[PDB]
Design a protein around this motif. Structure first.
Motif, PDB file in Angstrom:
ATOM      1  N   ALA C 273      41.258  55.271  51.393  1.00  0.00           N
ATOM      2  CA  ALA C 273      40.929  55.871  50.112  1.00  0.00           C
ATOM      3  C   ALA C 273      42.014  55.564  49.097  1.00  0.00           C
ATOM      4  N   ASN C 274      43.264  55.656  49.545  1.00  0.00           N
ATOM      5  CA  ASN C 274      44.444  55.420  48.713  1.00  0.00           C
ATOM      6  C   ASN C 274      44.515  53.971  48.244  1.00  0.00           C
ATOM      7  N   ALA C 275      44.122  53.035  49.111  1.00  0.00           N
ATOM      8  CA  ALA C 275      44.066  51.630  48.740  1.00  0.00           C
ATOM      9  C   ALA C 275      43.040  51.451  47.585  1.00  0.00           C
ATOM     10  N   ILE C 276      41.836  52.041  47.726  1.00  0.00           N
ATOM     11  CA  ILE C 276      40.790  52.001  46.678  1.00  0.00           C
ATOM     12  C   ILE C 276      41.367  52.372  45.312  1.00  0.00           C
ATOM     13  N   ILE C 277      42.125  53.489  45.273  1.00  0.00           N
ATOM     14  CA  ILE C 277      42.763  53.954  44.057  1.00  0.00           C
ATOM     15  C   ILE C 277      43.858  52.974  43.651  1.00  0.00           C
ATOM     16  N   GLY C 278      44.558  52.435  44.661  1.00  0.00           N
ATOM     17  CA  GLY C 278      45.640  51.472  44.470  1.00  0.00           C
ATOM     18  C   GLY C 278      46.949  51.979  43.866  1.00  0.00           C
ATOM     19  N   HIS C 279      47.602  51.083  43.144  1.00  0.00           N
ATOM     20  CA  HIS C 279      48.807  51.348  42.378  1.00  0.00           C
ATOM     21  C   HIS C 279      48.734  50.480  41.111  1.00  0.00           C
ATOM     22  N   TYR C 280      49.676  50.626  40.213  1.00  0.00           N
ATOM     23  CA  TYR C 280      49.618  49.778  39.044  1.00  0.00           C
ATOM     24  C   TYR C 280      50.987  49.739  38.401  1.00  0.00           C
ATOM     25  N   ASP C 281      51.239  48.656  37.707  1.00  0.00           N
ATOM     26  CA  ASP C 281      52.479  48.455  37.089  1.00  0.00           C
ATOM     27  C   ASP C 281      52.173  47.596  35.906  1.00  0.00           C
ATOM     28  N   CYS C 282      52.874  47.837  34.818  1.00  0.00           N
ATOM     29  CA  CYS C 282      52.632  47.104  33.591  1.00  0.00           C
ATOM     30  C   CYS C 282      52.950  45.652  33.662  1.00  0.00           C
ATOM     31  N   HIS C 289      40.262  43.925  34.290  1.00  0.00           N
ATOM     32  CA  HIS C 289      39.402  43.528  35.400  1.00  0.00           C
ATOM     33  C   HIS C 289      39.762  44.049  36.752  1.00  0.00           C
ATOM     34  N   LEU C 290      40.815  44.875  36.846  1.00  0.00           N
ATOM     35  CA  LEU C 290      41.207  45.349  38.159  1.00  0.00           C
ATOM     36  C   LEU C 290      40.120  46.232  38.828  1.00  0.00           C
ATOM     37  N   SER C 291      39.925  46.071  40.131  1.00  0.00           N
ATOM     38  CA  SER C 291      38.915  46.878  40.847  1.00  0.00           C
ATOM     39  C   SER C 291      39.111  48.399  40.614  1.00  0.00           C
ATOM     40  N   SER C 292      40.254  48.928  41.016  1.00  0.00           N
ATOM     41  CA  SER C 292      40.502  50.364  40.846  1.00  0.00           C
ATOM     42  C   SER C 292      40.183  50.811  39.414  1.00  0.00           C
ATOM     43  N   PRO C 293      39.246  51.736  39.260  1.00  0.00           N
ATOM     44  CA  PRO C 293      38.954  52.344  37.946  1.00  0.00           C
ATOM     45  C   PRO C 293      40.185  53.000  37.335  1.00  0.00           C
ATOM     46  N   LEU C 294      41.008  53.654  38.137  1.00  0.00           N
ATOM     47  CA  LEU C 294      42.215  54.254  37.576  1.00  0.00           C
ATOM     48  C   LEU C 294      43.025  53.137  36.979  1.00  0.00           C
ATOM     49  N   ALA C 295      43.274  52.124  37.792  1.00  0.00           N
ATOM     50  CA  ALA C 295      44.104  51.004  37.399  1.00  0.00           C
ATOM     51  C   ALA C 295      43.604  50.272  36.196  1.00  0.00           C
ATOM     52  N   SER C 296      42.306  50.064  36.121  1.00  0.00           N
ATOM     53  CA  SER C 296      41.798  49.289  35.028  1.00  0.00           C
ATOM     54  C   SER C 296      41.768  50.124  33.740  1.00  0.00           C
ATOM     55  N   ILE C 297      41.378  51.388  33.844  1.00  0.00           N
ATOM     56  CA  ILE C 297      41.355  52.260  32.661  1.00  0.00           C
ATOM     57  C   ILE C 297      42.781  52.446  32.165  1.00  0.00           C
ATOM     58  N   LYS C 302      46.427  51.902  28.058  1.00  0.00           N
ATOM     59  CA  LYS C 302      47.879  52.097  28.069  1.00  0.00           C
ATOM     60  C   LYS C 302      48.267  53.534  28.417  1.00  0.00           C
ATOM     61  N   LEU C 303      47.705  54.056  29.494  1.00  0.00           N
ATOM     62  CA  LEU C 303      47.956  55.448  29.852  1.00  0.00           C
ATOM     63  C   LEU C 303      49.169  55.612  30.702  1.00  0.00           C
ATOM     64  N   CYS C 304      49.741  54.502  31.057  1.00  0.00           N
ATOM     65  CA  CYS C 304      50.599  54.450  32.181  1.00  0.00           C
ATOM     66  C   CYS C 304      51.580  53.327  32.000  1.00  0.00           C
ATOM     67  N   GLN C 305      52.635  53.367  32.776  1.00  0.00           N
ATOM     68  CA  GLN C 305      53.574  52.285  32.803  1.00  0.00           C
ATOM     69  C   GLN C 305      53.545  51.862  34.247  1.00  0.00           C
ATOM     70  N   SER C 306      53.267  52.817  35.105  1.00  0.00           N
ATOM     71  CA  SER C 306      53.139  52.560  36.515  1.00  0.00           C
ATOM     72  C   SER C 306      52.524  53.788  37.168  1.00  0.00           C
ATOM     73  N   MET C 334      46.328  60.637  31.966  1.00  0.00           N
ATOM     74  CA  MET C 334      46.593  60.085  33.274  1.00  0.00           C
ATOM     75  C   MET C 334      46.096  61.065  34.342  1.00  0.00           C
ATOM     76  N   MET C 335      46.382  62.370  34.166  1.00  0.00           N
ATOM     77  CA  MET C 335      45.925  63.362  35.165  1.00  0.00           C
ATOM     78  C   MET C 335      44.400  63.451  35.252  1.00  0.00           C
ATOM     79  N   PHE C 336      43.757  63.531  34.094  1.00  0.00           N
ATOM     80  CA  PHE C 336      42.315  63.558  34.054  1.00  0.00           C
ATOM     81  C   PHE C 336      41.726  62.420  34.889  1.00  0.00           C
ATOM     82  N   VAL C 337      42.154  61.205  34.624  1.00  0.00           N
ATOM     83  CA  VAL C 337      41.649  60.053  35.403  1.00  0.00           C
ATOM     84  C   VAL C 337      42.054  60.043  36.877  1.00  0.00           C
ATOM     85  N   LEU C 338      43.316  60.349  37.165  1.00  0.00           N
ATOM     86  CA  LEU C 338      43.747  60.358  38.552  1.00  0.00           C
ATOM     87  C   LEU C 338      42.828  61.330  39.354  1.00  0.00           C
ATOM     88  N   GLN C 339      42.693  62.549  38.833  1.00  0.00           N
ATOM     89  CA  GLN C 339      41.881  63.585  39.443  1.00  0.00           C
ATOM     90  C   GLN C 339      40.357  63.256  39.492  1.00  0.00           C
TER      91      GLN C 339
END
Lengths: 60, 53, 446
Positions: C273-282, C289-297, C302-306, C334-339
């Motif tokens: 499940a954690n892989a699906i969500i992934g990680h991200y870095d600027c 185009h990233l698979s993970s919706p969190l990652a791509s959104i 620009k919700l995130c730096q990592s 970031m919380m809204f999307v992560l959750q």
């Protein structure tokens, strides 16, 4: 041996589907049981109703 | 053109929400019935016979 | 064409042995000219009390500064001169000392470890010199927002328990910890049955067993009567710790729910499940185009730096969630999307995403165990945790078993309508209220 509130939580509260279903089914009975139980309380303390008064006239 | 939503993933999505959509109807039915005192429907529930006959 | 499946069977079996000591000796032979060896002990801040917390960390400093047979800088010169590398680390449940070295140097490498693990001098002047080095590492650590935030996360999640404490300890323990406190912690913990001598490379099991018997026999020639080496479970608490500091340029935030622990099979599905969500870095190529919706959104808006997901495991408990870094006006998004993603997986996971998550775990598993050091660390600590090795193939079957259902159920169990532990550091005015975070852990449409 789990507890009651736990059972209630597992089977019915976890999902908002069941949670909501349970309360609508809860209101249907609460209303019926509250009206009845509460009317009887109102009557028991009074008793100069149109009820008892009636009894006297099945005739005309 | 609604064929955008026609595929395996959408069918699995539809499935995962069936129980939820089912249970929401349950809630809606019981709720409509109980708010209008559906004579028809209610007369069949054991208690809640506060309409004598 | 050897298939992937086939190649998993090609991985040689990890050989395990035990001395009369109780010391488990394990190896994975591979025919490299180089190898890694070391000892894994289950000792770490979680075993420490309020009073001696930071003890092991103090020993790790002293560990390489002189034994009885090789005092002062004699160690260094033996290692340095053979070209080997000598490292060590300590977590809350584990401690390790290992050598990277030319394979034909296994004999001395091992001779060295024993000496370290047993005859550590702890010369009074050294401990004093180290007092100031550690203090300094503390000031040093205070500047890593990420390190500070996970330390906060542990401190609130396990609030009245040993797992709440950090590895280095508080500054006052560093100030007052005495030699006797160390020797007692050592005697108490560096005992055979809680140590595993691990190796990986161009070695042979018998040589390692022989060396284990030669240089390690004589540790539990004693073994304690009523001592008390047991680990009590650690209460997890739904709570929040907010260290507001508007002087810092970005916010660090780490949320987690209670994980199950090293042993639980549920860990495989959780990681998928954690892989699906992934990680991200600027600095990631391709964001939209990233698979993970969190990652791509996160990349598009620009919700995130990592951000990264995680599954920390401890005995019978753990931290399962995600940590992220961002600008002051994006914490709420970031919380809204992560959750939203946890919820979505709990109730709605689809099949192809689980496949991607599965493959991501397969590549990660295999990519990781590449080279002697990582494999050694894996042999060493697996024996500490699982008791056995768990060959690639078994992991493969576990992963294969996971499908959408498993993700939905396993996620629901740990995530759905669960009280999280929140840690926040920095410009965190916009970090959502706890009630608000708590309400994001369930879905009203579900």
């Amino acid at each position: 041996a789990p507890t009651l509130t736990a059972r209630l939580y597992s089977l019915l509260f976890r999902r908002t589907s069941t949670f909501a279903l349970t309360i609508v089914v809860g209101a249907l009975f609460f209303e019926r049981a509250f009206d009845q139980g509460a009317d009887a309380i109102y009557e028991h303390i009074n008793e100069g109703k149109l009820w008892k008064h009636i009894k006297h006239k099945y005739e005309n | 053109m609604l064929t955008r939503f026609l595929g395996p993933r959408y069918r699995q999505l539809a499935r995962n929400w069936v129980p939820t959509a089912q249970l929401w109807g349950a809630v809606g039915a019981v709720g409509l019935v109980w708010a209008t005192d559906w004579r028809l429907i209610l007369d069949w529930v054991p208690y809640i016979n506060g309409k004598f006959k | 064409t050897a298939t992937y499946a086939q190649a998993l069977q090609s991985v040689p079996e990890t050989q395990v042995s035990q001395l009369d000591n109780g010391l488990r000796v394990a190896s994975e032979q591979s025919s490299q000219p180089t190898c890694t060896v070391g000892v894994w002990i289950d000792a770490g801040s979680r075993y420490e009390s309020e009073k001696n917390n930071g003890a092991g960390y103090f020993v790790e400093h002293l560990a390489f500064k002189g034994t009885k047979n090789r005092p002062g800088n004699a160690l260094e010169k033996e290692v340095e001169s053979m070209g080997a590398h000598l490292n060590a680390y300590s977590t809350r449940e584990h401690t390790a000392y290992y050598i990277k070295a030319l394979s034909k140097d296994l004999p001395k490498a091992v001779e060295l470890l024993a000496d370290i693990v047993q005859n550590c001098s702890l010369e009074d002047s050294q401990i004093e010199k180290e007092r100031d080095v550690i203090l300094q590492e503390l000031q040093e650590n205070d500047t890593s927002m990420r390190d500070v935030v996970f330390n906060y996360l542990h401190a609130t999640a396990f609030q009245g328990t040993p797992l709440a404490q950090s590895v280095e300890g508080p500054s006052e323990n560093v100030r007052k910890l005495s030699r006797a406190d160390l020797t007692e912690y050592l005697s108490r913990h560096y005992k055979a049955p809680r140590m595993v001598l691990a190796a990986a490379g161009g070695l042979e099991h018998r040589q390692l067993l022989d060396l284990a018997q030669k240089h390690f026999s004589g540790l539990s020639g004693t073994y304690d009567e009523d001592a008390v080496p047991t680990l009590s479970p650690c209460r997890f608490t739904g709570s929040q710790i907010c260290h507001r500091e508007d002087g810092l340029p970005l916010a660090h935030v780490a949320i987690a729910v209670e994980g199950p622990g090293w042993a639980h099979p549920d860990n495989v599905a959780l990681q998928v499940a954690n892989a699906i969500i992934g990680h991200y870095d600027c600095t990631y190529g391709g964001g939209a185009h990233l698979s993970s919706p969190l990652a791509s959104i996160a990349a598009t808006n620009k919700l995130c730096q990592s951000f990264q997901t995680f599954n920390i495991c401890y005995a019978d408990t753990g931290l399962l969630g995600a940590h992220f870094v961002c600008d002051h006006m994006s914490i709420d998004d970031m919380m809204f999307v992560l959750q939203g993603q946890w919820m979505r997986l709990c109730t709605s996971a689809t099949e192809s995403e689980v496949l991607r998550g599965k493959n991501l775990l397969r590549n990660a598993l295999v990519s990781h165990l590449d080279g002697t050091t990582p494999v050694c660390e894996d042999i060493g600590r697996s024996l500490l945790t699982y008791g056995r090795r768990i060959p690639l193939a078994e992991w493969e079957s576990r992963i294969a078993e996971v499908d959408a259902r498993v993700v939905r159920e396993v996620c629901s169990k740990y995530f759905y309508d669960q009280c999280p532990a929140v840690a926040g550091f920095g410009p965190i005015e916009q970090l959502p209220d706890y009630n608000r975070i708590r309400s994001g852990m369930f879905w009203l449409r579900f």
